[PDB]
Design a protein around this ligand. Structure first.
Ligand SMILES: N=C(N)NCCC[C@@H](NS(=O)(=O)Cc1ccccc1)C(=O)N1CCC[C@H]1C(=O)NCc1cc(Cl)ccc1CO
Ligand SMILES: *[C@@H]1O[C@H](CO)[C@@H](O)[C@H](O)[C@H]1NC(C)=O
Ligand code: NA
Ligand code: NA
Lengths: 29, 10, 250
């Protein structure tokens, strides 16, 4: 769906979960 | 260990 | 999930519980990919070495859950299965190659704060993100240790491992339809999936469009969280043509 992968309680409100930054930091390219 | 679920879901 | 933590509310709104009707128990994890389709591991439904061969009527799908055992009134939604589709070349005999299955629900599930589908990767997102060292996230209600059980959904972030290291960790023949993830003994941190987490999602958050993609399905390990072993995940993108064929046809 066009809205897939965007969480109502996180991305849709521009709130981050407590560990998603760990994922981003590993994406070194 | 699981709480009963409503009967409608059989 | 071993060495993980409690999920936040709404953290994994695509997480599905496969629930056996009789006896009432956790069968597996799974994920929501649209309002009518759920993705899981084939071995959750069919594994003859363990006398496992479930039919549609044996099972329920519970969506929107957080607590493992509670009936989460006004939050979770329970769906019946219309049809199961197992990959025709699923190799249960040898190594769980192509460990993937789809389930079509009888009726569409209503999305909510707690229920929302995950994206499936295209070739480009897969190429960019499926790299050694890059971390994904695994969720489930399976065992907290190999040899107990969680009150609520568990989450662990784990790095993708270089293919030679995956291969050298096991006597099983690894295929291109699998990848492995987990920390090495020297890395200190740990974590793994375990019994009951099967069929659940390995997800990554794209840094290009800030959406969550399901890259893997919890497939197999050798024990849980053992030093020098890794968890193996079905490579979702590699099997996407089959996924699309099933959804387009049915
Ligand atoms: N040299 C070999 N023969 N290697 C292949 C063994 C595969 C087997 N491993 S197991 O028997 O250890 C599963 C298990 C683990 C703990 C307790 C009971 C069973 C296994 O994982 N499974 C058998 C069919 C179901 C599957 C399974 O249990 N998957 C769950 C799982 C997934 C992941 Cl990613 C990590 C750890 C586990 C789970 O490992
Ligand atoms: C599993 O179940 C179906 C029907 O019960 C059957 O056709 C099949 O042969 C069984 N065993 C398999 C698929 O290995
Ligand atoms: Na090997
Ligand atoms: Na390990």
């Amino acid at each position: 769906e066009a809205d897939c992968g965007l969480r109502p309680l996180f991305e849709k409100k521009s709130l981050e979960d407590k560990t998603e930054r760990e994922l981003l930091e590993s994406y070194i390219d | 260990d699981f709480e009963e679920i409503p009967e409608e879901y059989l | 999930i071993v060495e993980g933590s409690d999920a936040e509310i709404g953290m994994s709104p695509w997480q599905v519980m496969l629930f056996r009707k009789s006896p009432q128990e956790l069968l597996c994890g799974a994920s929501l990919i649209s309002d009518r389709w759920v993705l899981t591991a084939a071995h959750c439904l069919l594994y003859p070495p363990w006398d496992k061969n479930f039919t549609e009527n044996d099972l329920l799908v519970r969506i929107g859950k957080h607590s493992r055992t509670r009936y989460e009134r006004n939050i979770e939604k329970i769906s019946m299965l219309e049809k199961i589709y197992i990959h025709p070349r699923y190799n249960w005999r040898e190594n769980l190659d192509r460990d993937i299955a789809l389930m079509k629900l009888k009726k569409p599930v209503a999305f909510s704060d707690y229920i929302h589908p995950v994206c499936l990767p295209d070739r480009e997102t897969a190429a960019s993100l499926l790299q050694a060292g890059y971390k994904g996230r695994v969720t489930g209600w399976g065992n907290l240790k190999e040899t107990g059980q969680p009150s609520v959904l568990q989450v662990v972030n784990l790095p993708i491992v270089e293919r030679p290291v995956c291969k050298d960790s096991t006597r099983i023949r690894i295929t291109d339809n699998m990848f492995c993830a987990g920390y090495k003994p020297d890395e200190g941190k740990r974590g793994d999936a375990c019994e009951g987490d099967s069929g659940g999602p390995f997800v990554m958050k794209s840094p290009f469009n800030n959406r969550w993609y399901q890259m893997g399905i919890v497939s197999w390990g050798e024990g849980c969280d053992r030093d020098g072993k890794y968890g193996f995940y079905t490579h979702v993108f590699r099997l996407k043509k089959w996924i699309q064929k099933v959804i387009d046809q049915f």
